[model samples]
Target: SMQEEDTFRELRIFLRNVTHRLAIDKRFRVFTKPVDPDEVPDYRTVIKEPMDLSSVISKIDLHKYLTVKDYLRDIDLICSNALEYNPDRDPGDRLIRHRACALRDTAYAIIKEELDEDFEQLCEEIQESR
Candidate 1:
């Protein structure tokens, strides 16, 4: 059915588009790099599974993602980790927290628009995996 090729090519293009969209967006600039645990007190101790745009951007270039959902999961973690960590403390945390929320919503919108049809396909992939 050439279904594998369809999924492969679509995911690659979609993920690459995400890198472009996020990397250049000014509001998302705060999250473009890894979270500096040194600056944020006990960041690692609390985060446990931290993620950031930089790593995902590299992964997109390296073609490391197997499933679209897995890639999406990392993006989610990027925002989730920040939001969770911020509410925990600090005055400057709110800025990062705001961007964290926006990044998640914007990213989800991109996936919804770009993956329109394949959105269903990925859902099926998720179900199949379980």
Candidate 2:
């Protein structure tokens, strides 16, 4: 799926970034220990909730995103939305984050295809501001 492909691509970028940073060997950087199995939540079950995109867009507290966990939660929410509403949407659907990302991209494409130029411009502006 496109979303999975994109996510794999993103992960690859992340790994590359890590590798590049680690190349700066003169600076000591501590990598966090991997989470124990007991500490990790079952992401499949945990990611089912629909995102409040409005909340994300309207966030006034920049300090709320102070940790990796917080960033992941937001990414999970966005990716889950993309997966749930695939390129060709079916309401009450279910899918993994990777698949959802593809669907979300499709949905965005569809909107761009269908909406007026002004509307698309407005959307772009809104997204940019957010």
Candidate 3:
């Protein structure tokens, strides 16, 4: 279908750009690598599904995300997991938790800007073609 093809093409470019931007952002320091289960006892138990910026980078290059939403889903998980594991007080990883929030906000803003306009372009083209 028209929507499907456009989604497929747009999503790849979208994911590529998003990952590239976030990959270089210094704010992604802690989220660059996967959390070590051994280092943090109960890390695996607390967060059943772990996510990191590097993981998302791999997923995008490997074409693992089936849709744009799926890409965001994993991207959000990086923040989600951190917030869940880190408490909201000093020495409780509040620093990391807050950074995670910042990262999430930044990423979402980027995605929204990239998506809203281009999707409309695709919608317009589809209608004209039909």
- Writing each residue's lDDT as its tens digit, candidate 3 over 1-130 gives 9666766566678778887787788877889899876788789888989998888878877867655666778878898899888875776487888788888888889867767766646645654574
- Candidate 2 structure lDDT: 0.39
lDDT of 2 by residue, 50-78 (tens): 44333433331333432223434653556
Clashes by residue pair, model 3? none
Least accurate 10 contiguous residues by lDDT in model 1: 118-127
Question: Which window of 10 residues has the lowest lDDT sum in candidate 2?
Answer: 27-36
Q: Is candidate 1 or candidate 2 better by TM-score?
A: 1
Candidate 1: tens digits of C-alpha lDDT, residues 7-30: 666677778888779879999887
lDDT of 1: 0.77
Candidate 2 runs further than 4 Å off: 1-48, 60-63, 85-130
Clashing residue pairs found in predicted model 2 = 82-100, 83-100, 86-103, 87-103
Q: Estimate each model's TM-score.
A: 0.76, 0.26, 0.76
Ranking by lDDT: 3, 1, 2
Q: Which stretches of candidate 3 lie over 4 Å from their true place?
A: 1-7, 117-130
